[PDB]
C-alpha cells in the first residue's frame, strides 16, 4: 500500500563521504559558449609570431 | 662523521644547563614583577589587569559516539581524537571561537609551567615520520626543533608556556598527550554550572595532575 514518498536524511552524509569535489581545472578555462568572434580573433592572434605553432 | 654525535651532545647539554638556570630565574621574575606591579597599582587606586591567557591546555572529556559533523572536524584539527587525550592550543580569536563550538566535548584552561613540564616529561612523546617516539633524551628535541631554535626540553617548556614564535612547530612536534581517566562529576553541565565541561581556568592544572 503506502510507502515513504521522500527522505533527505543521510543524503548529505553520503555526499560528504568523499565528496565536495571541485570541478576540474580545464572547465574553468574552456572556450565553450565563449564569443565566436573573440575566439576567431584569438586563433588569428596566436597564429602569428612565437606563439604560432603553424609551420 | 660517526663522531660529532658526542659533540652535538656537548652543545645540546650546554644549552640545557644554561637554559634551565636562566628560565627558572625568568619564571620567578614574573611573580615578583606581577606582585610589585599590583602593589604599584594599589598605591594609585588602579588595578593591574594581567595579560589575558596566551596558551590553553584542552582535554577531551566525551567519547567518539554521536559526535556532530562540525564538532568532529573542529576536534580533529584540535588533534583531540580520543577521550582523555590532551593537546595545547594557542589562544587566538579563531582558536577561541572554535573551542566554544566544541565546548561540550572538552574542558580547557591555562596550564602552569609545573603542569607543562610534567606532561612534557612524564607523558611527552614526539611525532617523527608520523611515529610516536618517546621523549627520553634532549637529542630528539634538538634533531627536529633546533631549526626552530629549541635544542632542549626546557627550551620546549618555555616555547609552550610563553607562546613563542616556534609554537606551531613545537606543539605539533609533541604528539597529542594520552592521559589516564578523568575524575569528572558531571560531563554535561559546564564548570560554571557545577559540571566539568568548558573553561576551568587554573583548575585545569588540578584536573590534569591526577591524569599526570
Amino acid at each position: 500500500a503506502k510507502l515513504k514518498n521522500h527522505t533527505s536524511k543521510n543524503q548529505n552524509r553520503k555526499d560528504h563521504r568523499n565528496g565536495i569535489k571541485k570541478p576540474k581545472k580545464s572547465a574553468y578555462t574552456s572556450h565553450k559558449g565563449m564569443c565566436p568572434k573573440y575566439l576567431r580573433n584569438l586563433r588569428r592572434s596566436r597564429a602569428n609570431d612565437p606563439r604560432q605553432s603553424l609551420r | 662523521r660517526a663522531t660529532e654525535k658526542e659533540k652535538r651532545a656537548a652543545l645540546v647539554k650546554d644549552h640545557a644547563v644554561k637554559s634551565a638556570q636562566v628560565y627558572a630565574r625568568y619564571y620567578i621574575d614574573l611573580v615578583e614583577s606581577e606582585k610589585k606591579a599590583r602593589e604599584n597599582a594599589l598605591k594609585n587606586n588602579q588595578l593591574y589587569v594581567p595579560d589575558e591567557p596566551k596558551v590553553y591546555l584542552v582535554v577531551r572529556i566525551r567519547g567518539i559516539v554521536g559526535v556532530a559533523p562540525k564538532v568532529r572536524t573542529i576536534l580533529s584539527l584540535l588533534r583531540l581524537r580520543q577521550i582523555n587525550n590532551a593537546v595545547f592550543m594557542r589562544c587566538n580569536k579563531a582558536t577561541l571561537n572554535a573551542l566554544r563550538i566544541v565546548d561540550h566535548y572538552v574542558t580547557y584552561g591555562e596550564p602552569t609551567v609545573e603542569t607543562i613540564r610534567n606532561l612534557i616529561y612524564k607523558r611527552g612523546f614526539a611525532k617523527v615520520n608520523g611515529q610516536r617516539i618517546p621523549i627520553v633524551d634532549n637529542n630528539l628535541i634538538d634533531e627536529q626543533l633546533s631549526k626552530h631554535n629549541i635544542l632542549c626540553a626546557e627550551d620546549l617548556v618555555h616555547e609552550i608556556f610563553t607562546c613563542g614564535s616556534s609554537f606551531k612547530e613545537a606543539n605539533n612536534f609533541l604528539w597529542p598527550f594520552q592521559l589516564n581517566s578523568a575524575a569528572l562529576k558531571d560531563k554535561r553541565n559546564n564548570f560554571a554550572e557545577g559540571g566539568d565541561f568548558g573553561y576551568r581556568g587554573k583548575y585545569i592544572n588540578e584536573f590534569v595532575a591526577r591524569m599526570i
Binding site: - | 588595578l47 593591574y48 589587569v49 589575558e52 564548570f191 560554571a192 554550572e193 557545577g194 583548575y203
Partner: protein, 170 residues
Amino acid sequence: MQKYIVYGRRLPSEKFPEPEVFRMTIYAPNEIVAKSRFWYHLKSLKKIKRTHGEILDCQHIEENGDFVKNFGVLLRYRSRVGQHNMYREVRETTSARAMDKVYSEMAGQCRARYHDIQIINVKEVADEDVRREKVAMFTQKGVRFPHPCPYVHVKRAARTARFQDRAPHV
C-alpha cells in the same frame, strides 16, 4: 561559599577611551563561577556582555570568623510560578559561611538552586535590628537549651555492628 569582588569594564572604544568601572561583591563556589555571575549581572544591569567587556580583577576576600554575627540576606528567586523577593537572616561566623546557610535553606524550603537565586544584598544586622525570630532567640545573652539531637550518638552503633549487650541510654 567564597566571597569575591569582581571588577569589570566595557572594552575601551573610540567614543569612550576610558569606560566606567563596575565592582560587584559575588559569593560563589569558585572564581570561574564568580566571573560568570558578574557578567550575568552586567549583561542585564549595564548592557555589557562578557565578550564586550573585560574583568580587570577578581579578588578573593577571605574573612576572620571567630565571632558569630547576624547576616541578613535579601534575594530574588524564580519559582515554578515566577520571580519572588525574599529577606532571610542567618547567624554565622563569616558572610561566605552564612551565604552557604542561606542557599542550603533556599534549596530545602523554597526548592531554588544557586542560579535561580540572585542576592540583592548581604549586610550584618545587630541583635536589636534582627527581624526574624529563628535568629532572635539565639541573640539573647544567655541561651540554655537541651542537646537538640542526643539520640544522634547512634554513630557509635554502626562501629558496634549493632551487637551491643545493653540498649544504650541517651
